[PDB]
Design a protein around this nucleic acid. Structure first.
Ligand code: NA
Ligand code: NA
Ligand SMILES: [Zn+2]
Ligand SMILES: [Zn+2]
Length: 327
DNA sequence: CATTAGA
DNA sequence: TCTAATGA
């Protein structure tokens, strides 16, 4: 956790590079398990030889580990850290809609900077167009202060459209967080569930409403159950406008809400931790359901869930408020 | 690990 | 159709 920190962070930097800059999924994949096992290793690694004893740790990485332990650095790392091409990919990739793929492609073409980005906006598709367009606004965290207003407005329209609608802004936000990165809004309705063959308009109705009153400014993507957009607080009586904010809306079959909701609220750790428990308690939990376990190794048979309570009950736990869903 | 775009 | 990207 810190006794092996550098070893791990070096290894990540290493790992991460293969993946993006070159396309060495293996190598890349190498560096990760290696960085995964050393993390757990309950002891200060003194040599690679020592490390080497590990699983996933081969000759390759031991080498590095020595140099890193020896001199507080790494040449391969110092060279990568320097290098423009790699540097560049690292950067382009920031634009929402730009994955390594395109990043490497642009790069080759000679599009290294953001400015290059603009001059060749033609080379960008809509997602990426908007990426560029709100590059700044995008990297900026959300004051819960703001979260509360946004949320305010969402709930009002959802309701006005149809009062049967059930929305939940899940996230860090839900878990009390002081700021968040994007607004994740959970959504299901009664007439929509597991079987009842969809109802696209069900998502589409609101998506409109929201754009209707100008809360939605753009659309990253929109399908029958997931809508990816851009929202924005009414820049009040001017002098101060609102940063454009990444927003995601999702439609759940009423019968699988809370699992979903439970799920998305996280945290990752509460998750696993909640997930690890249901196992001992004779179950199974996942993004949509909770099924009892059958001795034959496994089993199925989706339990009927009415609220984030039922799930606990099921695994007979203590209902942990979202605020305290941190671990 | 799943959904959407796109070419 | 495949392949990319976003989703902690
Ligand atoms: Na080994
Ligand atoms: Na990106
Ligand atoms: Zn020791
Ligand atoms: Zn989020």
């Amino acid at each position: 956790e810190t006794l092996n920190g550098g070893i791990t962070d070096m290894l990540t930097e290493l790992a991460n590079f293969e993946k993006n800059v070159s396309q060495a999924i293996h190598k890349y994949n190498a560096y990760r398990k290696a960085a995964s096992v050393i993390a757990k290793y309950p002891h200060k690694i003194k040599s690679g030889a020592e490390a080497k004893k590990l699983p996933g740790v081969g000759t390759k990485i031991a080498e590095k580990i020595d140099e890193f332990l020896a001199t507080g650095k790494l040449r391969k790392l110092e060279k990568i850290r320097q290098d423009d091409t790699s540097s560049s990919i690292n950067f382009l990739t920031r634009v929402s809609g730009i994955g390594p793929s395109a990043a490497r492609k642009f790069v080759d073409e000679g599009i290294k900077t953001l400015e290059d980005l603009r001059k060749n906006e033609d080379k960008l598709n809509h997602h990426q167009r908007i990426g560029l367009k709100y590059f700044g606004d995008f990297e900026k965290r959300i004051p819960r202060e703001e979260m509360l207003q946004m949320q305010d407005i969402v709930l009002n329209e959802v309701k006005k459209v149809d009062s049967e609608y059930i929305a939940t802004v899940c996230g860090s936000f839900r878990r009390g967080a002081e700021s968040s990165g994007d607004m994740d809004v959970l959504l299901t309705h009664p007439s929509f569930t597991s079987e009842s063959t969809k109802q696209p308009k069900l998502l589409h109705q609101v998506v409109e409403q929201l754009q209707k009153v100008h809360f939605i400014t753009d659309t990253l993507s929109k399908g029958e159950t997931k809508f990816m957009g851009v929202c924005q607080l009414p820049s009040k009586n001017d002098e101060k406008e609102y940063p454009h904010r990444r927003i995601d809306i999702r439609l759940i079959p009423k019968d699988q809400y809370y699992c979903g909701v439970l799920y998305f609220t996280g945290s990752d750790i509460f998750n696993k931790n909640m997930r690890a428990h249901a196992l001992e308690k004779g179950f199974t939990i996942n993004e949509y359901t909770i099924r009892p376990l059958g001795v034959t190794g496994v089993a199925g048979e989706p339990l009927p869930v009415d609220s984030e309570k039922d799930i606990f009950d099921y695994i007979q736990w203590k209902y942990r408020e979202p605020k305290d869903r941190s671990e």
